[PDB]
Design a protein around this ligand. Structure first.
Ligand SMILES: O=C1Nc2nc(N[C@H]3CC[C@H](O)CC3)ncc2CN1c1ccccc1Cl
Length: 342
């Protein structure tokens, strides 16, 4: 057991192993505050997230377990993984805090590309890495569900990692602009292809410097989407299990799909072709990450032998109802059994 020391970081008392030094706030994280630090044992700049009240409720305790389980599973260059997880607690009885450690990323995509049109080569590379990470994530039957520029971190080398797998979804907000229509409007049980829709939106924005579907609200956004991809056909309509949603869709005037070559004027014809394959209304028909990687647009980056898949991921716990202390004990076992990556 390492020796821990205490430090107050913005009215918060952090207790971390001595190996972590120079803790400095970098902002908020998903359900916890994040500090950048230097891991003297590995020489890595890391981000340390102290979870806020990890076990205050069943929902929080299960979310804490979920995040730890997911982070402990993700081992891929284009996905945020775990370098360390610790608690100053000496026993399950005293267990109350959880700290998660990851590589420190330089900036999120949003802050880098905001209002800026990128060069085709840069788009090729950024999207290639997103799809490579997605192939890995999807191979484990994991769906990201909230892919957007702010959840994509990049370093100075444009090296990219996917991270962070309602009032905040209302209005003119980027929190909803990259969502596939079927999840935005709860049309049906959605699959991993919702993530491909998000990549298409991100890719279009990198190419034009403009949000693809910057709706002022959910409906305005759907209209922007249908004007581009066309209103659904009978085949897709049958798949919208939500009768309410299906019924509203049917009230819209039919529109044929636009010519993407005339929307993305001047864009590489191959980028155009890939966008048309990702931004397909029917999720059953969207190109998969594995198929997209093999698309000619990524000819200069694709390598079938360097696009790994993940080990199987058991998420049977998602359908389990346990007590706070049971989720807490399962989380403790996962913290205690953690083995750092080489
Ligand atoms: O929340 C997180 N934020 C990060 N930020 C940066 N860099 C930021 C980018 C935005 C900039 O404004 C400040 C530095 N790098 C890595 C993470 C990792 N990270 C995380 C995810 C899951 C579990 C634990 C953690 Cl710490």
């Amino acid at each position: 057991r390492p020796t821990f020391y205490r430090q107050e970081l913005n009215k918060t008392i952090w207790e971390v192993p001595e190996r972590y030094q120079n803790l400095s706030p970098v902002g908020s994280g998903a359900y916890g505050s994040v500090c950048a630090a230097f891991d003297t044992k590995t020489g890595l700049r890391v981000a340390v997230k102290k979870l806020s009240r990890p076990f205050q409720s069943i929902i929080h305790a299960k979310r804490t377990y979920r995040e730890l389980r997911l982070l402990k599973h993700m081992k891929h260059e284009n996905v945020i993984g775990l370098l360390d997880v610790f608690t100053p607690a000496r026993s399950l009885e005293e267990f109350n805090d959880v700290y998660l450690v990851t590589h420190l990323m330089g900036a999120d995509l949003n802050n880098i590309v905001k209002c800026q049109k990128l060069t085709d080569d840069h788009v090729q590379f950024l999207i290639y890495q997103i799809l490579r990470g997605l192939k890995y994530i999807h191979s484990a039957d994991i769906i990201h569900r909230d892919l957007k520029p702010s959840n994509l971190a990049v370093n100075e080398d444009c090296e990219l990692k996917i991270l962070d797998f309602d009032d905040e979804m209302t209005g003119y907000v980027a929190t909803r602009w990259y969502r596939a229509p079927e999840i935005m409007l709860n049309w049906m049980h959605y699959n991993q292809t919702v993530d491909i829709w998000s990549v298409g939106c991100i890719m279009a924005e990198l190419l034009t410097g403009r949000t693809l579907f910057p709706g002022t609200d959910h409906i305005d956004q759907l209209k922007l989407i249908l004007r581009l991809v066309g209103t659904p056909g009978a085949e897709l309509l049958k798949k919208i299990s939500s009768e309410s949603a299906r019924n509203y869709i049917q009230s819209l005037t039919q529109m044929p799909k636009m010519n993407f070559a005339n929307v993305f004027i001047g864009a590489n014809p191959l980028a155009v072709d890939l966008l048309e394959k990702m931004l397909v209304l029917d999720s059953d028909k969207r190109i998969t990450a594995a198929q997209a990687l093999a698309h000619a647009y990524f000819a200069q980056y694709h390598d079938p032998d360097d696009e790994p898949v993940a080990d199987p991921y058991d998420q049977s716990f998602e359908s389990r109802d346990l007590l706070i202390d049971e989720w807490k004990s399962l989380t403790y076992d996962e913290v205690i059994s953690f083995v750092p990556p080489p």
